[PDB]
Write an enzyme that holds these catalytic residues in place. Structure first.
Site, PDB file in Angstrom:
ATOM      1  N   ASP D  51      21.511  27.936  35.739  1.00 52.03           N
ATOM      2  CA  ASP D  51      21.137  28.706  34.537  1.00 52.03           C
ATOM      3  C   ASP D  51      20.187  27.964  33.590  1.00 52.03           C
ATOM      4  OD1 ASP D  51      22.020  31.418  34.267  1.00 52.03           O
ATOM      5  OD2 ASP D  51      24.091  30.669  34.233  1.00 52.03           O
ATOM      6  N   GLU D  82      19.949  33.548  30.135  1.00 54.40           N
ATOM      7  CA  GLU D  82      20.163  32.392  31.013  1.00 54.40           C
ATOM      8  C   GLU D  82      20.521  31.121  30.240  1.00 54.40           C
ATOM      9  OE1 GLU D  82      20.647  33.876  33.497  1.00 54.40           O
ATOM     10  OE2 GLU D  82      19.001  34.394  34.801  1.00 54.40           O
ATOM     11  N   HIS D  86      24.335  32.166  28.895  1.00 49.04           N
ATOM     12  CA  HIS D  86      25.061  31.757  30.100  1.00 49.04           C
ATOM     13  C   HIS D  86      25.309  30.265  30.176  1.00 49.04           C
ATOM     14  CE1 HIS D  86      23.545  35.586  32.390  1.00 49.04           C
ATOM     15  NE2 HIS D  86      24.266  35.869  31.320  1.00 49.04           N
ATOM     16  N   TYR D  90      29.284  27.855  29.481  1.00 50.80           N
ATOM     17  CA  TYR D  90      29.980  26.858  30.296  1.00 50.80           C
ATOM     18  C   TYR D  90      30.433  25.680  29.464  1.00 50.80           C
ATOM     19  CZ  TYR D  90      27.757  29.481  34.097  1.00 50.80           C
ATOM     20  OH  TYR D  90      27.300  30.477  34.937  1.00 50.80           O
ATOM     21  N   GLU D 149      19.793  34.271  41.801  1.00 47.80           N
ATOM     22  CA  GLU D 149      20.615  35.254  41.080  1.00 47.80           C
ATOM     23  C   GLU D 149      21.767  35.826  41.924  1.00 47.80           C
ATOM     24  OE1 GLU D 149      20.552  36.041  37.931  1.00 47.80           O
ATOM     25  OE2 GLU D 149      18.534  35.653  37.153  1.00 47.80           O
ATOM     26  N   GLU D 183      23.889  38.763  36.047  1.00 46.73           N
ATOM     27  CA  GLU D 183      23.091  38.284  37.189  1.00 46.73           C
ATOM     28  C   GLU D 183      22.850  39.385  38.205  1.00 46.73           C
ATOM     29  OE1 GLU D 183      22.222  35.562  35.844  1.00 46.73           O
ATOM     30  OE2 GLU D 183      23.820  34.029  35.803  1.00 46.73           O
ATOM     31  N   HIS D 186      19.963  41.300  36.909  1.00 41.39           N
ATOM     32  CA  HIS D 186      18.786  40.406  36.982  1.00 41.39           C
ATOM     33  C   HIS D 186      18.233  40.333  38.404  1.00 41.39           C
ATOM     34  CE1 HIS D 186      20.037  37.748  33.277  1.00 41.39           C
ATOM     35  NE2 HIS D 186      20.022  39.039  33.004  1.00 41.39           N
TER      36      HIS D 186
HETATM   37 MN   LIG Z   1      20.052  35.628  35.903  1.00 43.20          MN
HETATM   38 MN   LIG Z   2      22.549  33.380  34.270  1.00 42.66          MN
END
Ligand SMILES: [Mn+2]
Ligand SMILES: [Mn+2]
Ligand SMILES: Cc1cn([C@H]2C[C@H](O)[C@@H](COP(=O)(O)OP(=O)(O)OP(=O)(O)O)O2)c(=O)[nH]c1=O
Ligand SMILES: Nc1nc2c(ncn2[C@H]2C[C@H](O)[C@@H](COP(=O)(O)OP(=O)(O)O)O2)c(=O)[nH]1
Ligand SMILES: Nc1nc2c(ncn2[C@H]2C[C@H](O)[C@@H](COP(=O)(O)OP(=O)(O)O)O2)c(=O)[nH]1
Ligand SMILES: [Mg+2]
Ligand SMILES: [Mg+2]
Ligand SMILES: [Mn+2]
Ligand SMILES: [Mn+2]
Lengths: 289, 683, 683, 289
Positions: D51, D82, D86, D90, D149, D183, D186
């Protein structure tokens, strides 16, 4: 020292065009004179055209050359706001107020306009001149970006804020106020990234970068005065708009860590109404002397 | 850009490798001649000016009626006979922007420096023409500076209170908490900073009349007080400032400290409420030996012993608290708490540190009460008694809430005039007058303690300026020798004047007979130790001035035993923030932060070199951050041994210093007898 | 899973196309025989139970000492002789979770329904055995239900007050604001909801002793009160609830409303403080004509006229305020303000709307004062006089702060027993006793007004339940006819009981002689208009019960004129939130929100069908959201004409309707004589 | 025919990790074996890396080369998701569950892990090989992006889904499901852009592009097998994860308009279980009844 804080402020300011209903503006739009409608259209197109450059080039090019994952993320978020939110918002305002043929003609006019083109191409020229691994060229582009975000937009923002402060075109004025609030934080953030580069330079190089910034400001300012008279003389506002340009030029300079260039002036009240050192444990023998 | 602003800006323009310090005289001359003389309202005679000021609700007719107009005219003559000139532009600017009387629209200037000094002196004398002339000579010579409230407001019809520091005890009850909020708002309305002792309030999760775990602790009261101070913002002029003090052995000490973290939640963080931590010697002893410490729930202690936890000696009662099963406590790490204190002071400058046993081991009024907390500026250290505010129908039990009157000797001007005794005694008389004329109608404990204790605070300033202008380094042993001798003399003459006032009025302060002054224990170190200078250079500074000896101190002890003491407290060294510019003096006894002060007023930037700064004494004006904080602690402890109250002790720290370094400074201050620590200022 | 909640969840399992409503009887039977009888402490005899409860601080000895134990035994036999059975699981669950007495560790159950009712009855009777038996019969038949404070705390030692609604008038001073904060915290500590009038407070940007733009407005006091209510939250089990009221012509009205906007900043928004807006007929007239309205600065009006703005008639002084140059006013658009009110009620349910001229055109005690604000539940509408809390040394001028005791008639059970007269009179006696035994020793004005006015609030509930169980639609004209007759009879018997109490005690409420009861103007519509039911269906509902005629009302008017009235106010229809479950009744006189109410308690999900819900009356239990709010307004206005105080009127809105529909409902309520509008609930 | 609906779908899916409180996972995390916690941390770290590069490099570079302001707005929005949403989520998970030293160690582990470095080298290499006005280099990078992805994330996604499906780590799992939902759209969108370019080619050129796509997939696949074994052998799940990545490889191919390449297999059923009011102005007639 600052990227996570700006991340927070940016994401919490997230908004979408659909949130503001635009149709109720037609109830005040119909009561404006031809010159007022003409100026508004031209100003709006000016803002739209400049903001597109910032979305397609300005923000993405800076995100590309800046090092740091967190900075790239904030810059990506700002680029997203330009392209996904601001651009759609300007389009929505236009489609509400003018028929398709009128929109096409205004954009044709503003696209050919000498003062709009001069500033648009000056800014774009500096973005195109950034070289890989050259922080001087990056700094110059950041200065251009701050000047757009914190200064060049404001000859345009004046008019929607002027109406907004009078109770006219309130829906589009609310949208413009949200856009302006985003550009303000964009300008401050890019300003901090420019100061970081500036502070890594020698004293001679600093003086040279200051001269660059002031020279650029002067060129843009003299063109803004002409741009201003061209649009606002027909509605009698140019004197007050000029005060607003200088006030915002000073904010842009302060964003770049520079002193204000212009003397302090009061602003039109209608427009105003619209507007850890290091933790170390005690290891004993520190209680004995 | 104003001409005087340009001239003041030429100081930084280095000519021949040196700052143009002489430009500030040109700057102040231009400032006067171009702005002040133009904007000063002039009257044909002093009588017309006085009549205009009284009739237009600018002055008070009560104090001016005490003199015939001839006496007032002679007082004004005495003020203007000195032909006082402001040495720097910043002195005149600060006076004419903060203290000079202006029209109701703040457009013109009614009062010059001489007019303000004459009015203050006439208010001080209370009908005595010779006394008024003496006050005029004392203030126009700038030997004594009344505090900002007194200097600004004396003799003004639309004035705030002449006292701005108040210390309130808060009892563990909703009635007392509501009364504390009310009194805090009333005193902040008058423009005074309010300090509140929160140690008696029971901690979070305590029982309220058989409903266990119902108390929000001291942090709910902290939020209430913060909003009360935000509301009582001095009519929207100056932000309401208040302080909260908590004992380090209070259970809510960690919650108390968490209110100042940068990551603090908005339902915990307080913005306008300064915090101070009271540390007994027991906590320092526990941290020194790394033994795990206990913080106690105050209401359990009150229920078990009938006395508040902060009303008892922790040194003797800590083991009994720990071994008592009916006293609730939680284990803490005292070293971790000290490190948290140092981290908080590095991050935000808070909390203030008050070493409880350092204050009370030399406190002269322990019979009345121990000193449990300090003021907003961390220099007022007096005995307090908590008030029992009962229900509306019942009668309240009014205690003693601390409020003292501030005044500052100019060490440079007092030393150059060889008038320690006369300046100290006249300042004591003026502070006594301010104490008597102060009546606060909405703080019954403050009013009762003002009437009973008659406590005053006589501070000093321009210590670093006097030392640097005499070629003495602030950290040098000679500087500490001068401080020792000077403040011993100040204490001697303040005690002598207080005993003289007691003899004249035939009355002492309430509960004087139990004080160490009455028993003579106060004078032990003065009748046993000689405080004359140990250096020939310092002894030459006091030439032409009688330094009190051991025999003089014995005579003073006999005089105090015979006649008593009028003031429970006499000396406290306040920060003296804005009056230092007007007096052309360095702030308090602290060393200078910067050699040349760069500040921006309006849209124009201003430069203020430290008073007396030049090429010859440039390196004697060592900046506080460049100094060794241990030597500054040594200096303040040398001064503290002659000051009955505390001293506003600001820590000046570098960015490179650690949390361990701040903790070491705090522990050395505790070791050296420092009573309070004000601020942790980092460069 | 518990067996009783498993049985209760079988209601929604549709068998043969119908809800299994009979499962709730099995659900409550299982609930009792598996939880309640097991967890109930049982004693050998009632004497041991009473001794155990008195000795361990569960009951009060004083009220139980007025009866010999034979009388208490007779009362308890009377309670248990009925053999009351809860018809639904929710009724018993709510009682044994909220009102049943439990051991100190909240482990077992000490009181059954009969025990609680007997204790409340013995508390009400105050030594009378026959009266205690009458109260037992009244409550065990569930004809009358004392409010949650009274029913929960009657006869308990460690109890809150029996009154939970308090209304405070705040004067325009810092002393009065501090006293308001203190009294609000004291009353929230007692468990009561506090409403404050903020109209007398001067607006933002007003002078505080000749310094202009100094006042922070009503929003600063709002923040102070919000934090005061957050602090006094009673362990946080029921957090402190406050209400603020502002006249719509106050200058701070827009900032007052902006405290409830979702986009409000943390330095403005208040969370624990409900808001109400008082709207005079002048504002509605100005909005109707689309004219330019003006909000006013209260301090300018007070300085110019010597009276507060809310103490003056706006319909007669608005033009004088506008034409007065010394009065400061701000131009507003009244229709824009109305639209903002509608939007705020749609998005948050706030503000409460009080139609001031609707309240005061029928107010019986306008001589004492006009009604200027309502309570937190927006149904208490009584005259108040502001207090003048002075400095500590000075005496305070105590005014009249509103507080009334709540009690609800169960319309279904009262109509079934044909006992409107006896229930109304006994409920009036019980509310009078609660008023007499209430003594607030930290709210002087609440105390004084409770002693002087002797106001009570006798409400009703189960109106929709009674109508739906009798085949009458809530919106139908027959329902309004029944409400008219029923509440006229309730008013008749409440006035009769008040007059009888005044005759027996020989005293009336303070300033009764100036009231409309004394002048006889109150009885005009009662001696002129007959309120007998106009429909034969409704007339049979009252068969066997005498309906007072015009002659009866003339006799009552003569009786009142010759003996006076004991209570200034008698009837107010409160929301009756949680006691409606215990009584198995619909909440207040408002229509039901859900036919079957689904709730989650802890990790358990349970369903509550409306009382008496079945297939034969499923469509008569029309949900409040599906019905026309105009017809609900008509019903509430029909009831309101017989209620001296207000009715907590909740507006039930669909998502489809715009702010214009809400504004139309508000304007129709104002047109129809609605006094207050409580909530804008949206589905 | 599709960008507008993708624009609307992307913006309506907008979220921030802070919307999900994570302290609820504290106990089910504490209860996992050391092997399980190790694999979980490493899995999410591998996702974070992907990501990071998709946000910093992949999405912005594709945005630069794709024509049309609306297409660019969608791609810019996806780029922001991203790295601003995303990749950051994490860290929210890590900061809740793990002490700083374990967090530091796992980020050091990504730098030195040969399979993770190889996959980043390959994907980013293709992004940086895009030549202006050269549609073939752009197609190759879009294939790489679809593979990232719709294929490469899935060796990572398996484990949070595997726990979610057992009622474990459900708050972290909620975040992961939101990421996966993004994703999926995407991968479809970029797939459609790739197909546009592919469809312009001769049959001979198409044959070469299929060869490129299949060769690249196989090369990435072989590396992913080794990565999967390295992470999952210690928790006994490698064979199961391998079936899952093959399943998703087929979905990636389908997003590119190609036939499935791997035969269908039964996936662990646990993992399958892991998957204001309108303002209307008042009229004059509203005040009369
Ligand atoms: Mn993506
Ligand atoms: Mn992502
Ligand atoms: C003291 C103070 C008052 N106020 C407001 C709240 C009160 O409603 C109002 C009255 O304050 P007062 O307490 O009555 O002040 P005052 O009596 O000295 O002023 P005045 O002569 O005009 O009566 O001022 C503030 O907003 N902030 C403050 O700090
Ligand atoms: N004339 C005058 N004198 C002022 C004013 N403010 C302060 N003073 C001081 C100056 C002198 O010391 C004193 C007397 O001034 P005066 O009344 O002019 O006295 P005189 O010199 O005429 O006897 O008052 C002022 O405004 N006017
Ligand atoms: N025995 C008993 N009676 C209780 C209790 N709580 C309420 N009561 C009621 C039930 C009866 O109506 C009344 C008298 O009960 P009792 O004292 O057992 O008397 P009795 O049954 O010998 O006449 O008290 C209780 O705990 N025990
Ligand atoms: Mg108490
Ligand atoms: Mg007042
Ligand atoms: Mn933009
Ligand atoms: Mn921008």
């Amino acid at each position: 020292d600052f990227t996570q804080m700006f991340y927070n402020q940016n994401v919490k300011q997230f908004w979408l065009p659909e949130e503001i209903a635009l149709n109720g503006d037609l109830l005040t739009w119909k009561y404006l004179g031809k010159n007022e409608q003409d100026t508004y259209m031209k100003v709006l197109a000016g803002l739209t055209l400049l903001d597109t450059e910032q979305g397609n080039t300005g923000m993405p090019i800076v995100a590309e050359h800046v090092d740091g994952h967190q900075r790239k993320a904030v810059l990506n978020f700002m680029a997203m706001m330009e392209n996904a939110v601001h651009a759609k918002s300007y389009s929505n305002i236009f489609m509400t107020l003018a028929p398709t043929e009128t929109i096409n003609e205004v954009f044709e006019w503003v696209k050919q306009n000498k003062y709009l083109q001069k500033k648009a191409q000056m800014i774009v020229g500096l973005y195109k001149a950034i070289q890989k691994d050259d922080e001087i060229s990056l700094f110059k582009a950041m200065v251009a970006s701050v000047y757009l975000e914190s200064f060049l937009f404001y000859s345009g923002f004046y008019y929607p804020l002027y109406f907004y402060g009078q109770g006219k075109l309130m829906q589009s004025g609310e949208i413009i106020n949200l856009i302006l609030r985003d550009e303000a934080i964009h300008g401050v953030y890019v300003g901090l990234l420019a100061q970081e580069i500036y502070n890594k330079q020698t004293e001679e190089k600093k003086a040279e970068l200051r001269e660059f910034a002031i020279d650029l400001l002067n060129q843009l300012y003299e063109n803004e005065l002409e741009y201003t008279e061209d649009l606002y003389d027909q509605v009698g506002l140019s004197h007050d708009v000029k005060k607003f340009i200088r006030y915002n030029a000073n904010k842009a300079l302060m964003n770049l860590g520079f002193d204000p260039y212009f003397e302090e002036e009061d602003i039109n009240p209608i427009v105003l109404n619209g507007l850890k050192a290091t933790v170390e444990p005690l290891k004993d023998d520190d209680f004995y002397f | 850009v104003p001409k005087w602003i340009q001239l003041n800006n030429e100081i930084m323009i280095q000519k021949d490798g040196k700052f143009q310090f002489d430009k500030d005289k040109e700057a102040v001359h231009s400032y006067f001649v171009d702005y002040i003389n133009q904007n000063t309202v002039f009257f044909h005679n002093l009588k017309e000016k006085l009549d205009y000021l009284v009739e237009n609700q600018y002055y008070e007719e009560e104090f001016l009626s005490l003199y015939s107009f001839e006496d007032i005219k002679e007082v004004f003559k005495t003020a203007y006979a000195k032909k006082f000139r402001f040495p720097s532009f910043m002195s005149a600017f600060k006076f004419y922007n903060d203290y000079a009387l202006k029209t109701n629209d703040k457009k013109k200037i009614l009062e010059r420096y001489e007019d303000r000094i004459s009015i203050v002196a006439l208010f001080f004398a209370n009908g005595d023409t010779e006394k008024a002339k003496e006050y005029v000579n004392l203030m126009i010579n700038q030997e004594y500076q009344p505090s900002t409230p007194t200097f600004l407001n004396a003799g003004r019809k639309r004035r705030g209170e002449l006292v701005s520091c108040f210390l309130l005890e808060v009892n563990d009850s909703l009635n007392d908490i509501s009364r504390a909020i009310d009194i805090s708002m009333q005193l902040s309305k008058l423009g005074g900073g309010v300090s509140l002792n929160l140690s008696k309030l029971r901690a979070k999760g305590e029982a309220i009349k058989d409903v266990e775990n119902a108390t929000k602790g001291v942090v709910g009261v902290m939020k209430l007080l913060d909003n009360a101070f935000r509301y009582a913002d001095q009519m929207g002029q100056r932000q309401g400032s208040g302080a909260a003090y908590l004992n380090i052995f209070h259970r809510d000490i960690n919650d108390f400290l968490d209110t100042k973290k940068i990551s603090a939640d908005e339902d915990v963080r307080v913005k306008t409420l300064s915090i101070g931590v009271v540390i007994p010697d027991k906590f320092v002893e526990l941290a020194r030996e790394d033994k795990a410490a206990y913080v106690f729930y105050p209401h359990t202690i009150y229920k078990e012993y009938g006395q508040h936890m902060d009303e008892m000696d922790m040194n003797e009662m800590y083991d009994k608290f720990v071994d008592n099963p009916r006293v609730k406590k939680e284990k803490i790490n005292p070293r971790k708490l000290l490190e948290k204190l140092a981290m908080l002071r590095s991050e935000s400058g808070y909390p203030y540190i008050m070493f409880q046993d350092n204050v009370n081991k030399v406190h002269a009024n322990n019979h009345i009460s121990k000193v449990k907390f300090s003021n907003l500026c961390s220099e007022v250290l007096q005995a307090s008694q908590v008030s029992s505010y009962t229900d509306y129908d019942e009668e309240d039990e009014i205690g003693l809430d601390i409020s003292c009157n501030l005044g500052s000797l100019n060490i440079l001007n007092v030393m150059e005039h060889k008038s320690i005794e006369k300046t100290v005694k006249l300042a004591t008389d003026s502070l006594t007058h301010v104490s008597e004329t102060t009546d606060i109608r909405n703080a019954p404990a403050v009013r009762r303690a003002n009437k009973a204790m008659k406590s005053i605070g006589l501070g000093a300033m321009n210590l670093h300026g006097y030392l640097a202008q005499n070629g003495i380094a602030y950290e040098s042993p000679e500087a500490r020798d001068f401080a020792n001798t000077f403040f011993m003399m100040v204490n001697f003459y303040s005690i002598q004047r207080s005993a003289e006032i007691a003899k004249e009025k035939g009355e002492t302060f309430d509960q004087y007979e139990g004080s160490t002054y009455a028993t003579g224990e106060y004078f032990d170190k003065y009748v046993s130790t000689d405080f004359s200078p140990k250096y020939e250079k310092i002894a030459n500074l006091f030439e032409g001035m009688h330094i009190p000896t051991t025999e003089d101190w014995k005579k003073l002890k006999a005089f105090v035993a015979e006649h008593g003491m009028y003031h429970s407290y006499r000396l406290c060294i306040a920060p003296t923030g804005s009056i230092s510019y007007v007096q052309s003096s360095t702030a308090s006894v602290m060393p200078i932060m910067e050699r040349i002060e760069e500040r921006t007023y309006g849209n124009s930037k201003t430069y203020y070199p430290m008073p007396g700064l030049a090429s010859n004494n440039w390196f004697f004006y060592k900046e506080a951050y460049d100094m060794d904080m241990f030597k500054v602690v040594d200096m303040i402890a040398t001064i503290q041994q002659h000051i009955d109250q505390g001293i506003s002790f600001t820590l000046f720290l570098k960015d490179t210093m650690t949390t361990r370094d701040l903790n070491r400074i705090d522990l050395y201050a505790h070791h050296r007898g420092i009573k309070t620590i004000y601020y942790a200022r980092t460069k």
